[PDB]
């Protein structure tokens, strides 16, 4: 869309000014979903290999959950960064082109007609 913004050094997963945002908390509902997906991978892995899925090795599943939790948190910051960026430059633009977005005057519903359509 983003791609081509000023100061957009490529192949960067987290530019420095992105750290000026509130980092996601470890109990983030989005983050815990990342952990849930990792756990579901552990069950599939044992099911694929014909193993006792519920407790077929606590090492394989532990890596599955941790890896997904890890990759989620970094993805969340970049997620949080871009959305913050998307709204940020808008506010700079919205004050940079005042004439394009003129505030329409406010008239209460005591004036506006709505030509009520009866139902029968």
């Amino acid at each position: 869309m983003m791609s081509g913004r000023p100061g957009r050094v490529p192949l960067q997963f987290l530019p420095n000014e992105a750290r000026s945002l509130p980092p996601p908390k470890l109990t983030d509902p989005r983050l815990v979903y990342m952990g849930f997906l990792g756990y579901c991978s552990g069950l599939i892995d044992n099911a694929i290999r014909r193993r006792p899925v519920v407790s077929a090795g606590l090492h394989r599943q532990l890596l599955y959950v941790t890896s997904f939790v890890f990759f989620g948190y970094y993805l969340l910051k970049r997620q949080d960064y871009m959305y913050a960026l998307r709204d940020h430059d808008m506010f700079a633009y919205v004050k940079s082109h005042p004439e394009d977005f003129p505030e329409k005057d406010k008239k209460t519903y005591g004036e506006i007609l709505e030509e009520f359509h009866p139902v029968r």
Binding site: M34, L37, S41
Partner: peptide, 16 residues
């Protein structure tokens, strides 16, 4: 398999 069936709730990861 897991990443290809249940990642729908993580749709707003599009901004990444």
């Amino acid at each position: 398999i897991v990443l290809s069936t249940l990642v729908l709730p993580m749709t707003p990861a599009l901004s990444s």
